[PDB]
Design an enzyme around this catalytic site. Structure first.
Site, short mmCIF file in Angstrom:
data_model
loop_
_atom_site.label_atom_id
_atom_site.label_comp_id
_atom_site.label_asym_id
_atom_site.label_seq_id
_atom_site.Cartn_x
_atom_site.Cartn_y
_atom_site.Cartn_z
N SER A 123 -1.68 15.86 -11.65
CA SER A 123 -1.94 15.45 -13.02
C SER A 123 -2.27 16.69 -13.82
O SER A 123 -2.82 17.65 -13.30
CB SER A 123 -3.07 14.42 -13.09
OG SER A 123 -3.39 14.10 -14.43
N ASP A 128 0.79 -1.21 0.00
CA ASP A 128 0.00 0.00 0.00
C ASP A 128 0.84 1.28 0.00
O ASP A 128 1.37 1.67 1.04
CB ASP A 128 -0.95 -0.07 1.22
CG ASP A 128 -1.87 1.11 1.42
OD1 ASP A 128 -2.03 1.90 0.49
OD2 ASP A 128 -2.45 1.23 2.52
#
Ligand SMILES: c1cnc2c(c1)ccc1cccnc12
Length: 330
Positions: free
Chosen positions: A199, A35
């Site tokens: 992004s 994770d």
């Protein structure tokens, strides 16, 4: 040194990925959920409440000649999905695909919440976010990556998750045969303890690219892609019959649909998530209504580039002096 291990989806939907990890002496192999959104290496164990263990492989520290109780240390974590676990700490030898760390904090669960018990395929988690998020008290512990970093050939780890197929986690090297084109690196903020980046925009199917800054985290421990409501509405508006359902808790769509792709920007580069990656199957057994793999981050407070997004790319978690994230098509 380097490490290389195969990661496997736990089910037909790629709800999560498990990677075999050797702990203790003799080795006790447990399948952990790597994770990058948390920083605790915790396992189901001989100390876990009996009624809370249902099929998982347990770590028994009494059977390990290298296990040492970390005196006074306790841990307690709560995840974004409402799950939780807590317990005590041992230090032990931990190996991932040939790469070995001695004296790694292995957090032994005394208690786990229902979702963990219900998932027989996951024996625990192996956190790969920044060590600042580690929950060990009163002395915070380091992640497996942080402990191995100085020993690695290159201070990096890579995630290459497969779509309905096995993938790989590599430590200390970049496999140039595992991706196409080149790797685009982008800035990382470690201020929240996550591999948080920006992004540069998105596209829906064959649609025009929207230049817009999306701040979010690269998170292998989250199944889905959680993005702003405006972006997720633009995506599901292209799917006939798709709707946001409050009873199901997200966007659902006709199982008979063929989904369009979703592109996200990494600098001037583009990662294309094929439409089939966004189908998470029937909302309930035998339903013709399917759950979407792109969901709104409005209720979360942070955008999450989970497995849906990460599995469409070869991802470099660069732990150099100034950490960065590298993305490449594959
Ligand atoms: C992650 C989160 N929620 C889900 C899934 C994966 C897969 C299927 C599903 C069906 C109904 C509601 N939520 C989910």
């Amino acid at each position: 040194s380097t490490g290389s291990a195969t990661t496997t989806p736990i089910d037909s939907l790629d709800d999560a990925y498990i990677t075999p990890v050797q702990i203790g002496t003799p080795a006790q192999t447990l399948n952990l959920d790597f994770d990058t959104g948390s920083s605790d290496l915790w396992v189901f164990s001989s100390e876990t409440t009996a009624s809370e263990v249902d099929g998982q492989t347990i770590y028994t520290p009494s059977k390990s000649t290298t296990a040492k109780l970390l005196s006074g240390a306790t841990w307690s974590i709560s995840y974004g999905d409402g799950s939780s676990s807590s317990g005590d700490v041992y230090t032990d030898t931990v190996s991932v695909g040939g790469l070995t760390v001695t004296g790694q904090a292995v957090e032994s669960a005394k208690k786990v919440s229902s979702s963990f018990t219900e998932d027989s395929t996951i024996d625990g988690l192996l956190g790969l976010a920044f060590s600042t998020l580690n929950t060990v008290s009163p002395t915070q512990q380091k992640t497996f990556f942080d402990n191995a970093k100085a020993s690695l050939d290159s201070p990096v780890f890579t995630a290459d998750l497969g779509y309905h197929a096995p993938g790989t986690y590599n430590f200390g090297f970049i496999d140039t045969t595992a991706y196409t084109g080149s790797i685009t690196y982008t800035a990382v903020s470690t201020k929240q303890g996550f591999w948080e980046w920006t992004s540069t925009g998105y596209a829906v199917g064959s649609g025009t690219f929207k230049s817009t800054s999306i701040d979010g985290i690269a998170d292998t421990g989250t199944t889905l892609l959680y993005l702003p409501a405006t972006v997720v509405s633009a995506y599901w508006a292209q799917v006939s019959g798709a709707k946001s359902s409050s009873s199901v808790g997200g966007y659902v769509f006709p199982c008979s649909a063929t989904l369009p792709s979703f592109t996200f920007g990494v600098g001037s580069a583009r990662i294309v998530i094929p439409g089939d990656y966004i189908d998470f199957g029937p909302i309930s057994t035998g339903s013709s209504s399917c759950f979407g793999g792109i969901q709104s981050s409005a209720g979360i407070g942070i955008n999450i580039f989970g497995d849906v997004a990460l599995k469409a790319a070869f991802v470099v978690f660069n732990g150099a002096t100034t950490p960065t994230l590298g993305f490449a098509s594959k």
